[PDB]
Amino acid sequence: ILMAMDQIERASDKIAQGVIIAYRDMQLERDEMYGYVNIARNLDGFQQI
Amino acid sequence: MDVLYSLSKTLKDARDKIVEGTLYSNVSDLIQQFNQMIITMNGNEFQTGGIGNLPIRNWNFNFGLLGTTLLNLDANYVETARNTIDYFVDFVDNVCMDEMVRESQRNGIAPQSDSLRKLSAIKFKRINFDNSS
Amino acid sequence: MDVLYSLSKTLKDARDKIVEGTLYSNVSDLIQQFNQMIITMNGNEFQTGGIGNLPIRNWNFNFGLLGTTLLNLDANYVETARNTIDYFVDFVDNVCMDEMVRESQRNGIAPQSDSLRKLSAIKFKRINFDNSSEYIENWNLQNRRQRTGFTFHKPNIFPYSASFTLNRSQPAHDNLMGTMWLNAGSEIQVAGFDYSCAINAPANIQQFEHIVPLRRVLTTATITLLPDAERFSFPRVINSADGATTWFFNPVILRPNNVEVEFLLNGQIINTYQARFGTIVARNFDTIRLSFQLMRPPNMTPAVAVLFPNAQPFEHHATVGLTLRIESAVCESVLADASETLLANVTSVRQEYAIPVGPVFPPGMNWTDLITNYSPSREDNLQRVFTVASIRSMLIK
Amino acid sequence: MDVLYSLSKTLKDARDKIVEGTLYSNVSDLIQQFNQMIITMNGNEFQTGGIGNLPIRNWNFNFGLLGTTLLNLDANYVETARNTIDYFVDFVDNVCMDEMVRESQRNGIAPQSDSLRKLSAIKFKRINFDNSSEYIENWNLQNRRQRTGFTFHKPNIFPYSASFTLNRSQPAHDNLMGTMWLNAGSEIQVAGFDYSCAINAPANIQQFEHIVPLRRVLTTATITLLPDAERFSFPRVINSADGATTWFFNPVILRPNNVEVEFLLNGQIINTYQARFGTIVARNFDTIRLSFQLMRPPNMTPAVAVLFPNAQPFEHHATVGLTLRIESAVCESVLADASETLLANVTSVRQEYAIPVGPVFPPGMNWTDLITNYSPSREDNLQRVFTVASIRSMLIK
Amino acid sequence: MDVLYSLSKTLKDARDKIVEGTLYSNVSDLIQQFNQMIITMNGNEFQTGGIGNLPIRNWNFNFGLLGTTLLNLDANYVETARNTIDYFVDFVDNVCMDEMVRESQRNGIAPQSDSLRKLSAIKFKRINFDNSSEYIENWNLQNRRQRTGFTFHKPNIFPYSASFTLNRSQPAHDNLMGTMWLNAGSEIQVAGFDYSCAINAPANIQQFEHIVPLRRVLTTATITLLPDAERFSFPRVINSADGATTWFFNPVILRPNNVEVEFLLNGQIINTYQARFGTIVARNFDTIRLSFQLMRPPNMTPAVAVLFPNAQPFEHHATVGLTLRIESAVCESVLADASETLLANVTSVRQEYAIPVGPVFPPGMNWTDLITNYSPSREDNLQRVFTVASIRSMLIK
Amino acid sequence: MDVLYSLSKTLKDARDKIVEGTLYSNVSDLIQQFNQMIITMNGNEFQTGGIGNLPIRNWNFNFGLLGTTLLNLDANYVETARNTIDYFVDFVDNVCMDEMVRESQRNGIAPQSDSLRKLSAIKFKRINFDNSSEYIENWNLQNRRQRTGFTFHKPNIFPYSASFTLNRSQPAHDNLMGTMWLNAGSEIQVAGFDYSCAINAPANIQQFEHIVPLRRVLTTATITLLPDAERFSFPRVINSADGATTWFFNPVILRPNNVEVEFLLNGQIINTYQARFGTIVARNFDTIRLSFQLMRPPNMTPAVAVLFPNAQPFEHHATVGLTLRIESAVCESVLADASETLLANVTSVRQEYAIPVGPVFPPGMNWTDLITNYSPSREDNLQRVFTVASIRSMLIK
């Protein structure tokens, strides 16, 4: 359970892992699951709270 | 200049007071000053060096505040604080070197490095602490 | 060590801050520290001494906490605080002496006295306070393996050595060339002498060199370099190298030309100064190389021509000197210097209590021998004892 | 460095323990460690090489965890593990080579490659596992500021030297007294020779001394001392001190008289052995002083007496020698011995990839020069590269 | 082979870790492994011996499992475990001896004993455990066709050879030029001699070369090179090349001139050292070429000039020598070294049980012949027997 | 002894495995063992020292159990563990030194120090962990009276003895014949010399024999046999048998003839090698018998016929030789060897703390005297102190 809980939570659909604000114009990414989304796949380059 | 001295003073106090086992009452004021410094510095970018063989270094401040402990701060607290203290100490070292290697015939009292010129702005004046040296 | 320093610092801050009439807002935090010190030390038995003439003493702590209900301190509060502080200060003094009188070939920095070993336990870490002084700061830095630095005024980096090296000589010692030198503390005086005044030398120039290797690397040193060695400019009668006989030295001083002072680190020339006198700076070095030449004056007035003949009888001997003093320096290791009394305190304690000669330090804490053979174990032990001496000096006047 | 060692240790343990048919209870902890390593390394990017001919390599980690639910591992599990193990082993190999090939004159003990600098971060501290090898444990002890020790079998502590000193000499080299020596690796061979066999010496005894100082203190050393220098017991034609000419040495070997071997630390006698050959123990020393005498045989049979006349013609030259071999020792600083292959690994990597000579080590990692001028920066860099070499050798063979 | 190694490893762990009083959390996994071993081996019959004088012994396995319901294991647990450990250790002993005393020209890697053939069955694979030893690691690697590496302290790589080449000679053997050499184990010792001292040679230099080809490619080897061959520096009477007569060798040693030691790999020069002595590194090589020169001394004092006349009678013969010792090395194949005892164990078992000479190994496991002709079949059989011998030594002295 | 070893092993594992960031599953078993150790050792008081200069030390144990409620270890956990580990390590060090510096004529195998006798109680059996080390394994095997075995590289089994026997001799020492040997450490060099070169011997052959009986039985020993005695092949002036005069030995080396090396047990030839040099194997022996011959060359060139006349003025003395080195061996008893450091550790502790000469070991732990008279009591005491030294070395370096 401890090794697979990260994956189970990520697979969940009613919650996200966080929100990057970034205060700048970022092009919406194009994904199969949805035409355009503000999907961030990693928090690299941003201070985390 | 006063801002640079205040950064050095608060870093020296953090190094010499934030030690495993000490009471939190011994460093309440220091931690408040340190967190004020972190808040004020966060989001600001600095560039140091570029004269002679002094390397050009870029400094970005993205740090969380120091926490609290009920009675006595412990090893985890000291390590977490030490990471930020080391980064700030490196920054102050480089700012001081870049100031030392520069001179101006006119307005020699005025700051000569871009880092110290930025620090002389009004936003950083909240980092002053005590000018005792 | 950090706990011992914290005890000393708390006691000093108590003896200076807790004074009658002062606002309790001025000493609230200090009193919290003092009460935690008392709570942590209560119920512990310590034993100090037992080595040499240092008496065996026992210490038991059962004290009450300082009050906290006053807005201003009065006579009674200061009196009770002083009564507790006196006993704590006596305990600190005896712990410091017990630690200073002890050595160890292995793990020199580790606590050696029973009291300091007991204090090294984890229950006493609760009393740590702030490590602000230079020596405790460097102690923590070297414990974490950082770059330490001690600032010395006239560091005692050169072992005493007064000697001479002859490059030309005879059984009669009536025509000599060579150098004489004194290295002492922070001063090098070197004088090259030539009896013939380079009459037959190639280009009438006689070269002299002097290499002083330091046992530790100094950094950011201010150095005064003057063009004459006053110590070797008067007539002398000197034992011969073997000691069988004595020879006569009758100097007459000329200016040294082509003076070159090179400060080297690991055989690499870090700083170099030519024909430069006064205040110079050596940023990082562990060897000093002085080169200087005696040049026969191309033109002489009669009183100088009489002095310097071409025949053998050389009544007056040409001499060119240099003096080099390290006014201040920075060293990663610990040294005795002219402004600090740490070596004096350690030696005084050992002499007062007749501590038997140990396996690490030379007898009587002889600084000549210490610096001459400054091994890593000696450095560790010396840093420990100097730190303890500084802690003691915080309290004992 | 601790993270790198943990990576290599985990990969070696996975290679050794993840085998077909083994109970999963045998490797449960190992697989937890492996999954933790994979999690920590996932999503990070590394670069290695770029110095000399070492190729620039980029490493990315997007691996999946390993199963934890079988009772006995099967072939599928072994192959699935091995595919990831190969990539991780290659990454560790290249990081280790990148660290070995580099050096720094300042802070040589700190990581030099960017990959190891990245691994120094706190995020990677989750990969620590075990620190049980000699070099890693000495690394950790040194960082904790405790006593370290490397045990060496035949340590290369003596810089290669082969030379003679002539106390009595003439241009014709017909009547010589002096010593010859070879200090190499872990052996000292010394031979004092006198052509006249002490005919005119006081009490017909010629004294010989040989002092060998070491660059580092050796502890708990086992030594073999034998009474003959087999290297200096045959006819030789040597070249003069200045190389002008050649002189003859036709030795005849006598027993060495009054053999004294002193092991000194800080100039004080720690151990001393008189007329005792075989296995001896030197507990703590940094200098070896060998004293031995050539004593003219008071009684000689005619065949012996004919060898040593009282006039100049000397066809046989009386020689007395000692041989000293350091079989084993313990040193605080890293050295090169006959059993370990760390120096070979470092030198081999540097030579294979044609690393340009740096600012610290001598060309070709020449051990003679390195141990001749064993400085602090050199010691730090040497320990770092040897630790990395041990980490790499855990995996590469 | 892996199953045999795992039986030995689990027995060693059981005999080390199952000691009265130890917590059960210290031996949980080990007891799981031990119980699985017992379950798998139970109900099996093995037969060992029947070759030479090795007794024919039968092994029936029927043992109860070890208990699991215990916090700190007690005397009963230890006794019940040791009774089984003794039988299993004896069985492993005999299986290993049976394996060692056998050889096969075809498929020397395949198990030879019928007991090991049985253990090769897939039913026993569940006992595999952890293959952490060096020899089992290399066994698995060479099974997978991966790189193998064995580290040796002075490996026994040179087949014994004491010989001499005469490049110039005649029946009188009074004017001879050539070389002498002794190769043995890890030491080459060569010495080129010239009776005329290169009086009539161009530039008064005589060239000597010595090529030693290894049967296997050594890697990352530390080598001690010295400039004299003490073995060929004393008077000798050597029987002629054809044994007809004997000739006299009266050497006088000169320094070798223009020394070049180069390590070659398939004819290409991988390493080369010019006039350098001490410790050197050969990264990857299979041949050693040592070239040196006898240079007649350009200048001679009379005591030397007497030694080398212009005419025929040459009482003293100029000799220049080299000594080379491989202190440590790495080899892909299995070899005999100083520290390990695998060759000794195999030879001891064969001699003790009077095993008839087979087709592969030479009589009495003569290492000189085995390494002189190190055929692939011999390498396979030697690796098998050495691996099984290490497995055995893991339990028996 | 077993409990002390378990303490040392637990502390070594604690220092190696308890590191910041490590997964708790990597340490859980060790933490259970460590808490068991703390529970067992709490509330007991120990005293060590008091012999020689070894300081008296008192040890008290009151420690809290290490936590078991973390996923990854953090700085807090490591800091809490480190203080306990340091105190325990110091305790183990002092116990080991106190046990090493003691000895007993009767029951030397039994614990001698108060601390170790206390630890031998039944309450301390709960800490046994695992007796993996070789010395503790052999300790347990010897206690059970199973067969022990220690593997040595270059074992020190021959007490240093250099001597000679003269089968033929006269006052003038012109026509000697006999043998001349050095036995030291692991090497035997024996030379048989004849001044007449077997001119009058039967069949022109002179027989030579040399018997070296070992103090203990050696097993599976790898030997190196070479056909010359380099140590005894140069001119020597040697004191006569009674020390009243000196004689001259001027060797000329011939090949030894009919060399026969026998390794004998209980007077029965176990291994026999004829005219085979290089690496050989002796499976089990307690005496080495070297037989060789000086055969006058049947055919001689003029330069040899001159050397070997018929009359008394023999200027060159024929000599044959043999060298025998024990590269690696196995012994049931403990011995000093080149690779290990246990003898050095024991001798170092005794010398450092000035332990008075006791009733068992010779002064200064002189290995020559010890092995020369290796009594059963000395074997018991030596095994005890070596095992304690190994336990200590697990923690101290």
Ligand SMILES: [Zn+2]
């Ligand atoms: Zn060896």
